[PDB]
Design a protein around this ligand. Structure first.
Ligand code: NA
Lengths: 67, 67, 67
């Protein structure tokens, strides 16, 4: 039963090896996924910045026009 | 020190690992879900932003006429 | 090999798995932390966009007074 118990451990060890390598691959792909999302959020923030800045100029242009 | 002590200890660690691996799979799934969700949220934000940029371009032509 | 060798080998693999497990836990926490930070940021970009939308409506009314 020590042999059967060692045999069971080698079996579970093999499954743990396979799963750990699968998880490593997924974790690294997800890190890459997140990089793409962060890049897009940044790009969008820059775009919102540009809109806001131009709104400030528009408001001032309206003030100039009003006189 | 007996082989029995050691397979005892290996069964203990193996079960710890089994538990940690489940926890890891559960939290990875959550994270991959969050990745998909944030992707959706970005896309909806980019679209609304596209529309604001375009409304500003329309505003800027009204201002030009008045200048 | 003997039960004794098989055990020694399981012990080397079990140690390897503990190390990898610790590393994958850390990379999953990193991905979670990144997600929660980006969630915060997109919410803030949406909050600003909403303000920009209402400002465009106010700009239109002001442009209207000018003609
Ligand atoms: Na505007």
């Amino acid at each position: 039963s020590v042999e059967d118990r060692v045999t069971q451990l080698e079996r579970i060890s093999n499954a743990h090896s396979q799963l750990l390598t699968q998880l490593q691959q997924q974790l690294s792909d997800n890190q890459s996924d997140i990089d793409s999302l962060r890049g897009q959020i940044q790009e969008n923030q820059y775009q919102l910045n540009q809109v806001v800045e131009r709104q400030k100029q528009i408001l001032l242009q309206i003030d100039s026009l009003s006189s």
